[PDB]
Design a protein around this ligand. Sequence first.
Ligand code: HEM
Ligand code: HEM
Ligand code: HEM
Ligand code: HEM
Ligand SMILES: CCCCCCCCOCCOCCOCCOCCOCCO
Ligand SMILES: OC(Cn1cncn1)(Cn1cncn1)c1ccc(F)cc1F
Ligand SMILES: OC(Cn1cncn1)(Cn1cncn1)c1ccc(F)cc1F
Lengths: 445, 447, 448, 449
Amino acid sequence: KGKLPPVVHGTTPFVGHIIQFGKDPLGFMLKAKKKYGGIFTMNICGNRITVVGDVHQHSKFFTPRNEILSPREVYSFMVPVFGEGVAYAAPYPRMREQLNFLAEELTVAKFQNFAPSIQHEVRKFMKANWNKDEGEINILDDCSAMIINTACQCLFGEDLRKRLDARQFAQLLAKMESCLIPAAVFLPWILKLPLPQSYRCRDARAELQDILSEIIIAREKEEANTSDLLAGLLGAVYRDGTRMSQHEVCGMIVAAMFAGQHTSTITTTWSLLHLMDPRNKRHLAKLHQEIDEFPAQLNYDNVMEEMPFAEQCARESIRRDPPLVMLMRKVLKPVQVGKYVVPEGDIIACSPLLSHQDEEAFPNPREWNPERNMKLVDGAFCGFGAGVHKCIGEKFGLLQVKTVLATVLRDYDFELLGPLPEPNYHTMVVGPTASQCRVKYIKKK
Amino acid sequence: GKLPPVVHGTTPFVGHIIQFGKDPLGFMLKAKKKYGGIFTMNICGNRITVVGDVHQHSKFFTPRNEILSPREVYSFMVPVFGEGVAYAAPYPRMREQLNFLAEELTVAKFQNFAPSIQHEVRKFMKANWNKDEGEINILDDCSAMIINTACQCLFGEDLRKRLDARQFAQLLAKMESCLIPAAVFLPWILKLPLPQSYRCRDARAELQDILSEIIIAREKEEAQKDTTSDLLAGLLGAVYRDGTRMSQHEVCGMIVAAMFAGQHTSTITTTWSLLHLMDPRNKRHLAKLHQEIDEFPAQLNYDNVMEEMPFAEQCARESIRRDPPLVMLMRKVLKPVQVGKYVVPEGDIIACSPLLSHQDEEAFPNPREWNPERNMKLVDGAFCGFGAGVHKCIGEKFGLLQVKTVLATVLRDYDFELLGPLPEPNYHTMVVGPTASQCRVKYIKKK
Amino acid sequence: GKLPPVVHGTTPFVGHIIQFGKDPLGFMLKAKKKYGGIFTMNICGNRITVVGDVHQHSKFFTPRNEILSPREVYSFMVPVFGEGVAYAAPYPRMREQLNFLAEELTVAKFQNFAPSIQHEVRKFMKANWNKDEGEINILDDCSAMIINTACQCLFGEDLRKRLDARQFAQLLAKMESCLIPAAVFLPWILKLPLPQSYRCRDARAELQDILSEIIIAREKEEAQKDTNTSDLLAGLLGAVYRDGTRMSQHEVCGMIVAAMFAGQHTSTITTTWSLLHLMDPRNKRHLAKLHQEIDEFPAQLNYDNVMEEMPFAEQCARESIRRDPPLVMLMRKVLKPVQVGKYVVPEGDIIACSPLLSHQDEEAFPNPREWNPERNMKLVDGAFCGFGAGVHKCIGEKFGLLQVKTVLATVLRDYDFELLGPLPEPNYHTMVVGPTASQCRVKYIKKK
Amino acid sequence: KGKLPPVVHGTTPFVGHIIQFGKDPLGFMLKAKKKYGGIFTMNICGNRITVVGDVHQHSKFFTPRNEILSPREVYSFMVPVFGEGVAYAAPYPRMREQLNFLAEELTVAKFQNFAPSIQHEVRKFMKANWNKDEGEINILDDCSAMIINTACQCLFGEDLRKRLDARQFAQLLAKMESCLIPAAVFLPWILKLPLPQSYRCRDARAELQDILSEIIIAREKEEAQKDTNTSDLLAGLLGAVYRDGTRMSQHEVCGMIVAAMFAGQHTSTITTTWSLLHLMDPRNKRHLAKLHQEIDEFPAQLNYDNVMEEMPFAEQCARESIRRDPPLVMLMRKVLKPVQVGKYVVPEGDIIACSPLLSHQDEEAFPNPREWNPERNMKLVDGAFCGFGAGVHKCIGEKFGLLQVKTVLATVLRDYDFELLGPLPEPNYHTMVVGPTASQCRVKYIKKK
Ligand code: HEM
Ligand code: HEM
Ligand code: HEM
Ligand code: HEM
Ligand SMILES: CCCCCCCCOCCOCCOCCOCCOCCO
Ligand SMILES: OC(Cn1cncn1)(Cn1cncn1)c1ccc(F)cc1F
Ligand SMILES: OC(Cn1cncn1)(Cn1cncn1)c1ccc(F)cc1F
């Protein structure tokens, strides 16, 4: 009993498929699925990675417990950012607890005065950098800018932004992001070489933790209130009565800012790219309807329970081109999947990038269509993952994407300068090709 | 001949990096003291001989490219310049390319740069410093002014509509991001699949398509040919000694090299100077500076800044003497060079540090003191903020043009005040400047 | 939960290697003495904890693969075994594979092995030691006799026609050229464009095509179905995984190379050492007692003569391995923390048992540098782990001992030996540790 | 005043054409030569290498003095084997004298009893290893073994082979060669990595040096009687005298003896092998026939003369094998001063190369290039054949080498016939010295009955 998933042919003797796969990740798998079916095994530098390409077996990957499927080792290449013993790095229970701490820091109830704050930053930026009747900009960069500004304005209190504003923090982030080497998942060793990056990362992170400390100690003096994400983590308590270290606190914060930064920016950038695509005049018009009925100053309910189509666009761009191409786990205990049995020590993966393309659940995959149904196949859509490690920021993330859309589209139109941007898979968080993201903007004179 | 003294305390495979990393300047200061000006570090199996003896600077800046070559030591910048450009190009191709740029930067090319610079510096202040007073990050604001004043001076109008200063400084970041100076000692780093590496290529590619985009339109519109040459136009006119023209690839690479070069160094200089100018200790220097500028009208002309601003230059030059933006100039020894009593073998990396040399107490007594009145020629050849000899900075004139001009304009309308102890230099970055976070300052105008 | 001491004196990025490489045994002898049996070295930024406490051996050999895994620590050998074979393969896949080889080496598979071993050993003697007396390198000669006897026993007649023991010895060399054990601590080594890595690739390719061309040729001739004395290849071709499927020609080639490589070096070293000690003046009594045991035997030995009636010969071989174990460092990757003695070894750490170190423990093996066949191996139950223990315990022990024993009994029945200098000292700079080859010149004597 | 050769398109960001090149060098270059012409420029990890593919300009690569075109930096990857300051690692004048010292040790006047010794080792091995009516062997390995045996027998004196035999020596060559990483030419930093191979090499060369030394201090004591002496290679490199009146150092001696043995080993065996493989190929029946006629005449104990000047076709076979698949596939030089090549100019700092592999496929100079024809005209285009290089560094072992290959061919085929068991081997371009893919060299030998 227990059959093994087919190992993809044409595997180099020792380097595996890392080259074949790297060049064209989507095509590689997309083809591979046809020759061997949904479930198949890649050999990446001696590593067995088995992808769940069958959309009907997703629950098999998102359901099992950490004891069977584990994310600790797979995501260890991020330790430099989070810090040692933080998040995934820590033991499961410790990890479980910490992730939760952040989760509740991003729940609807904590969205007080977030909509206005987002609206405030988006407009200050627009009235700062798009002050001409019409102008040429890189929408990917400008969204990344607007996104970080609004993310900080919401999760950071006033005293924190004064000593460390949005533009300065971004700098710390990039310095810490410069040591994130995703190939480290297949080359754990590369994380042990003498690298300058990992030095600049220790610094940047150490600088942040210093500020935080110097703000906590400042609050502890002025203590003798709109509690932000910071004050939120400093209050949380473990199951044994102890609190988080400033090291742990600093780690979660960074994780939150990184996590929400690129995904939200990409999910916004895409949409805009689609909505401004001539083939979408339909969706663009409908959207304007949905928001033309809104006043200048938006409120919580306005975007949460009254912008369904907007959310559909946000959720459709993520279905077409998922920011996270490959969700991985370490198989600690053998798991039945389809007609196959993925063995222990193997690397098991569900690719949002892949599954999203199954013509069965998503016929005509390469067409950006908000209208199409996401539930057509249950568990098929995994843009925010599912089960144990479901995105705990989906709500907060959608809030931004949507509020930024509304804001931008209410005041500006857009046109493409060339063919639609094609996804670039050479980045940890996948987004449209930056060099293909040059666009013109129409002001509403 | 005998080899220099190899500073002891070397680790099995690391070498001195660990200790050099912690403090480069301190490390050398200590070494020079113990071993003398000429000593040898070992950086990951790589031998690097620094010319600490200030008297021997010419031994470094003088020899021809046959003996000393910057080609292999500057390759890590290929991602910025592009394949086969600048250093990444054949030796003679490098010389010709660098000349073409040197010619595009001669004083003869500064006709309305003065007015341009002031315009941008007055649009920024009136837009970012409008309150009676306020707190800001000077280093960040000077950077913004510098890229603006550069793009306004070197970039034609038709080019600036496709890519304004802001969006250009945007593409620089994405390209500077890939830069890994350490690659000089750990070459395999470049061979490693790193995101940054992809970043740079795409950023450079984006600037590439705009330039070409811009170019051909110029040819189409070029038909009338009846009546102001920018940098892009100048380069496109350069013809090699073999009768061929630079390729759009080479034209792009050179423009980036120019902008990248003048962007960081110019802002770092302008900023430092300002910081020293607002320090209590330097009350006298600030007073003398105003006198020199108080005489000038609203609109400054080329002469005013160049010939009639001698102390301004001394301040800027002194700011580069104290905290030199380019801390380590390197070369590859292709043939043994006699330095002092010593002889540097071939294959060895020879280095002159404007940072270490600018601390020489003989040449610069009270080194950590910012004194515009000090004598730079005390030891002829000591100061090398602009490198020297064969590879002397080809943008010194244009650079000083901005700095001096920018200061005259800002200080004419504003005063400044520190918010803490004067920032310390941050050595972690490829172009050394004052620690960013320490650069918040308050501004004041006294109409 | 307390960590084992980290032996002090570590350079920044190198670790203890430089020191350890100079002298591994001396380093572990010095460590063990200072910090106690359980300690931790650093090897190029890799924590490696050696279970030197000879009373804690079970805590290394016993844990299940989930906890302690050999898979990654043995991946530098992939170029030899092949992609997804043996260690490279998934654990279930692996465990089954090794069991197949296991079953092809049970004592039930020694039908005419003894006679085959003698024939070779006598063919070699009468071809290379024909003079009244002569000078020879006994290590080199034992290597030949061992590869000849192994091939004779395991390879069918058709296989040996295409690839004789000499030809196969070549392939082994070509293949074991790449191996870079250091790849264990410096993995990127395997990524570099090294000549070695291509050589392996090609050599295993050669052996690969011959096995395949032999198989398809056995299938055509199979049309007759005449009685065939199934060889090692035959048996593996007859193995079936729990999932019904059969071993591929690739995996079949791997297990054959695996066994041949494993037995060739360890068998020859054990043989040579034993001969070396037996000819050492200090061991006149031991040689004398050995002859007594084998004088009673006839020209043609049988399975029972060597198995149940050569207990002192085996002792000699077993004590040779106790003194100078061929496999010096057994390693595992720690997946889940393990309680060892008082200490706890954290996950991500490499755990090791060094037979070499363990076999020197004075409480277990007093006067440890003395080759004493009379010594008690079980003085401290568990101390001796020449053949490993627990889950991965050697599966060729019996077959290996069969050879060493049968060979000793043949050689010493017709020959005597004298050293030409001080007894050879082990050379630790090889993947499998044996006596120094250059110190291996020896004088032989015809008996009669 | 000059034009730069075209640079081939499609360059990967940091690895250049390295991946494409590595796959199929011959093809890559062939296609490049086609698209761009004989003189083109590849980019190997930021390194510009210009290949003189125009078989008419070969002289512009082999001629120039060292000051213009230098082999030092290009050949520094062999330093671990020759040693610091030896051979190319040395200063040119120093270098030249050392090669000279080796040259005069390999001239034809030193060969009287070479032929007989060669035959002896070849036969000893055949009767030792091919003593059956017919058998299956890897002709590559076996020729390798015979070649290393004969070489030693010819250059080492008895007292040495006593202390050192061809089996032990080959064992040291192996150890040392394990550090020869050709790629190190483009990726020098490679040689600075903590690799165990470089330690194994230090130890092999230091062990060989000690052996040689104990032999020398012995030849200096056994000296007093001064018994009749036939000096071996070692004896000769001990008498050589620099222009400054000083003698080589045991380190320098240890290097040259090693460089000689290495250079002589692989090429001799690769050429002998290929030859044998082509002769056993059914398509070359007439060539195999013509060869048997040239040797049949000779007696068992071949003589220096009859092998030197009475075995012409036998030599043409060795020389056409080298022309088809040159062992040394890429001859490089560092350009210190620019050089005019054809219309183009090769700039300083650039790596320049002459590819025997590429030039040898020139349809004009060698029509039907992939066809092994020993009757072809090698001079059809004067200068086109460069298997033994030319000019400043032309092979000094050419004559000693051919002497081996030919004598080995005459001995082997006199008693044995061969049949391929598969298709003609294809060259394996993944080794420092290029030969037939070893795994494809299994062949059937047949005792002449
Ligand atoms: C709309 C944009 C977003 C997308 C498309 C997205 C996508 C995902 C996906 C696919 C996963 C599952 C990863 C896996 O299976 O290993 C995940 C998990 C996670 N996300 Fe996001 N995410 C988004 C926004 C955010 C935001 C805004 C935050 C916080 C501010 C965040 C924080 C997290 C965290 C902490 C987890 C791990 C949860 C756990 O391990 O239990 N994400 N996200
Ligand atoms: C005012 C601040 C500046 C300082 C302190 C400075 C400093 C230097 C130094 C020390 C060198 C020689 C370094 C070496 O030997 O590698 C150099 C060369 C160079 N500089 Fe600057 N520079 C400044 C402004 C500029 C500007 C505005 C440009 C505009 C293009 C520029 C472009 C260049 C170029 C292209 C070279 C290379 C010339 C060669 O290879 O010989 N620099 N500079
Ligand atoms: C007679 C001298 C021998 C000695 C001293 C010896 C030693 C050892 C040792 C200590 C181990 C365990 C290594 C570890 O735990 O990592 C082992 C495993 C092994 N040996 Fe041997 N061995 C000998 C002969 C043989 C022979 C004749 C064969 C047959 C080809 C063989 C095949 C194997 C195999 C296949 C394993 C792996 C088993 C597993 O991983 O479960 N050995 N040997
Ligand atoms: C047929 C077999 C041989 C071939 C195909 C061959 C080929 C070559 C080639 C092409 C060169 C030029 C290398 C360059 O330009 O950098 C060369 C140089 C050299 N060869 Fe050979 N060779 C052979 C036999 C030998 C023999 C028998 C020896 C004797 C030890 C030898 C020793 C040398 C030496 C010392 C050099 C360098 C000479 C110098 O730098 O001036 N070779 N060989
Ligand atoms: C992802 C594409 C497929 C290839 C995957 C790996 C590619 C690696 O390219 C070459 C990397 O070379 C690694 C060299 O690392 C050298 C380690 O140096 C460590 C420090 O050395 C001195 C002190 O130990
Ligand atoms: O899931 C990520 C890490 N991701 C990047 N590569 C593979 N997975 C980011 N992503 C998830 N939500 C939003 N972005 C993450 C998970 C947890 C976390 F704290 C940060 C973080 F980036
Ligand atoms: O020409 C070689 C070096 N060769 C190896 N890679 C590239 N060229 C060998 N070759 C030349 N003749 C015979 N073999 C050589 C040159 C000089 C030397 F001393 C040794 C040596 F192998």
